[PDB]
Design a protein around this nucleic acid. Structure first.
Ligand SMILES: [Mg+2]
Ligand SMILES: [Mg+2]
Ligand SMILES: [Mg+2]
Ligand SMILES: [Mg+2]
Ligand SMILES: [Mg+2]
Ligand SMILES: [Mg+2]
Ligand SMILES: [Mg+2]
Ligand SMILES: [Mg+2]
Lengths: 55, 100, 271, 77, 149
RNA sequence: GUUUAUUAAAAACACAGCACUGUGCAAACACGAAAGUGGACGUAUACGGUGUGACGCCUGCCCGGUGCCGGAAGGUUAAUU
């Protein structure tokens, strides 16, 4: 359901240095976090999101 | 005969050829009884990180439904086309036509 | 395939053969053959110039198209056949205009496959294009040193050349030996590796096997007398000398290349 | 035939002497080179086997005068 | 070497000067060309009688070249065809001979040796600029475009 | 299998196999004052040299000496000036 192109919402679940925020903090469900991570990694590959703050 | 989602970024200097490539790629699938369910030209966008000493790329979206061979034979063309860099394809179960 | 012979007799225990059922069992293409005679290592003066050459089975040369200048005419692989003159096999191709030629068989080529040569040819094994149009990082074989001169690199059974960089009018090639060399982008190359990669797994098994292919015995320098070889003799087995060639040049380490003409194209040596 | 076509220089034989004055026969041969000189009169390039000294002779006398001597000697060029 | 210049040379000197140069420079370049001749008493007297007309004649050669340069410059567009691939990438190339023939075809006769291609060999489609050297002191320019189907 | 034709046929030589090393093609190398020729109408799964000598289990330590390879700031150093 979570789409990697839905780029506006992705910063809500990543930090400044590109860290993926853990579910314990964001409170997202386990199922959604798994697909969320896939979306984030997918976006990073397309240069839509940064892997880290250093490039 | 499955649903596919195709994203490919081209060299910014080739921003004037993107309409041509879309027609050729669309023609190839439509010739094999396929049909395009979504087409979107996202324009030149800022890259999150540089690729090959390059910072701006032209983004487009292409969600299609076609047989195995036409995408498989389309991938090889993507490889040797220097204009396009870092293309991706995906598998989907249902056709989607949203603005996104 | 590689088959180990059963030890039915000495000289057959250790023999390992390379069997390719796809090779043509019949006679070669007669109009594309010519006679080549054995020299025995003798030059025009009659002196033995290179040693350990002599005898062996009679062989007939076959004109192999090393240039591949037939541009824009597709051809079909008629058959693969054995080539006594080289480690690799040769694929007989038929251009649809009615002309037949011999080419080195690539890794995956088989009878009936489509092959095309030219600047606009598709990127498939067996197709010949200038390295200018060939994408970088692609494996190629039968590379020409000069445009139009014919391929001279990666002609052996399983050899190949990797295109690593393309800068301006020159392409840097990773040769099979490990040395990096610069060649003009206008030179042609054939996509894909050379076929019959199992040629290195065969074992002759017996002394006569080497003789069949014109390799005469090699005599060690230690067993020589001082007059014949620098290693000389000595009562018993005495060496006490730095190893050298039979003409006194030090071997086993001494660099020998002295070509100042083309060291410009050698970006990096093999080691 | 390592002979200059202009000055007629040919290899000559001498011996090289070491510090102990040992004499071993040797040969002195000229600085012949293959060079082509334009003939301003005939609009064509002429190539002949000449030495460094011979080139200077052509420089001083001129190519046109030099080829005249070769014709007199019957040497083909 | 001491030589007599028959034409304006870029850096060595001007017409009629007596300036020494390297033997190789005069032997292999100036003498085979018309730029200069060896400096000897024989030619010096011949030069003096020939001095008046050579200076006058060399003025007409660059005048025709300048006139021919304008004629070349008049044809501001030349169209050539070649093997053009996808996204305008040509598999082949457009050599100096190809561009030379185009200008003479229904145009002005231009030698193959006066075409200048500093940016390369025009291996890409579109329109590019090519320069010619009709004479040592004149220039010609024109836009050249290649298209094919 | 080969060898001292005519006192030595062998444990000697060769051998398939193994290893080191050279060689990017106008290859190294070799015969030639040179042209040229062989290597090879072959192209590093190729070719030359060297040692070992099927196969099986293995092949330890030492780079001071000699040789080779790499670098070379410095010292010393030829013709020439
Ligand atoms: Mg040998
Ligand atoms: Mg051996
Ligand atoms: Mg003995
Ligand atoms: Mg002893
Ligand atoms: Mg006896
Ligand atoms: Mg006996
Ligand atoms: Mg032994
Ligand atoms: Mg040991």
């Amino acid at each position: 359901e979570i789409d990697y192109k839905d780029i506006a919402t992705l910063k809500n679940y990543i930090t400044e240095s590109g860290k993926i925020v853990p579910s314990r903090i964001t409170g997202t469900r386990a199922k959604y976090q798994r697909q969320l991570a896939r979306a984030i990694k997918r976006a990073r590959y397309l240069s839509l999101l940064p892997y880290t703050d250093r490039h | 005969m499955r649903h596919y989602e195709i994203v490919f970024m081209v060299h910014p200097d080739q921003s004037e050829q993107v309409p041509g490539m879309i027609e050729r790629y669309t023609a190839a699938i439509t010739g094999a009884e396929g049909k395009i369910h979504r087409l979107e030209d996202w324009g030149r966008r800022q890259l999150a990180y540089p690729i090959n000493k390059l910072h701006k790329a032209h983004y487009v979206l292409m969600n299609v439904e076609a047989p195995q061979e036409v995408i498989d034979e389309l991938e090889t063309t993507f490889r040797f086309n220097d204009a396009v860099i870092r293309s991706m394809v995906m598998r989907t179960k249902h056709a989607v036509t949203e603005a996104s | 395939a590689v088959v180990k012979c059963k030890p039915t007799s000495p000289g057959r225990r250790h023999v390992v053969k390379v069997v390719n059922p796809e090779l043509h069992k019949g006679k070669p293409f007669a109009p594309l053959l010519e006679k080549n005679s054995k020299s025995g290592g003798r030059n025009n003066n009659g002196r033995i110039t290179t040693r350990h050459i002599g005898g062996g089975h009679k062989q007939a040369y076959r004109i192999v198209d090393f240039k591949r200048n037939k541009d824009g005419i597709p051809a079909v692989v008629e058959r693969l056949e054995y080539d006594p003159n080289r480690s690799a096999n040769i694929a007989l191709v038929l251009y649809k205009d009615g002309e037949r030629r011999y080419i080195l068989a690539p890794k995956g080529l088989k009878a009936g496959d489509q092959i095309q040569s030219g600047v606009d040819a598709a990127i498939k094994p067996g197709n010949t294009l200038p390295m200018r149009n060939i994408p970088v990082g692609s494996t190629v074989h039968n590379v020409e040193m000069k445009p139009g001169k014919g391929g001279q690199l990666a002609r052996s059974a399983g050899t190949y050349v990797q295109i690593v960089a393309r800068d301006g009018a020159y392409v840097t090639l990773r040769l099979r030996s490990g040395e990096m060399r610069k060649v003009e982008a206008d030179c042609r190359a054939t996509l894909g590796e050379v076929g019959n990669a199992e040629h290195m797994l065969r074992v002759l098994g017996k002394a006569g096997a080497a003789r069949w292919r014109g390799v005469r015995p090699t005599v060690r320098g230690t067993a020589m007398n001082p007059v014949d070889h620098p290693h000389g003799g000595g009562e018993g087995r005495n060496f006490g000398k730095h190893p050298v060639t039979p003409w006194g040049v030090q071997t086993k380490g001494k660099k020998t290349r002295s070509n100042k003409r083309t060291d410009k194209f050698i970006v990096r040596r093999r080691s | 035939s390592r002979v200059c076509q202009v000055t007629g220089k040919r290899p000559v034989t001498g011996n090289n002497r070491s510090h102990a004055l040992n004499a071993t026969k040797r040969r002195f041969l000229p600085n012949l080179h293959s060079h082509r000189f334009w003939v301003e009169s005939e609009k064509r390039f002429v190539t002949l086997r000449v030495s460094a000294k011979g080139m200077r002779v052509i420089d001083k006398k001129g190519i046109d005068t030099v080829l005249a001597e070769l014709r007199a000697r019957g040497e083909k060029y | 070497m001491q030589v007599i210049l028959l034409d304006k040379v870029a850096n060595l000197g001007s017409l009629g000067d007596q300036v020494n140069v390297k033997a190789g420079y005069a032997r292999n370049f100036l003498v085979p060309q018309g730029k200069a001749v060896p400096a000897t008493k024989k030619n010096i007297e011949f030069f003096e009688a020939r001095r008046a007309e050579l200076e006058a004649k060399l003025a007409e050669v660059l005048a025709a070249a300048n006139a021919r340069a304008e004629k070349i410059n008049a044809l501001e567009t030349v169209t050539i065809a070649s093997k053009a691939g996808d996204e305008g990438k040509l598999f082949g190339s457009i050599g100096t001979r190809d561009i030379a023939d185009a200008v003479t075809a229904a145009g002005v006769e231009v030698a193959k040796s006066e075409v200048r291609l500093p940016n390369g060999v025009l291996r890409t489609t579109g329109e590019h600029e090519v320069s010619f050297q009709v004479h040592s002191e004149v220039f010609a320019k024109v836009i050249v475009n290649v298209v094919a189907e």
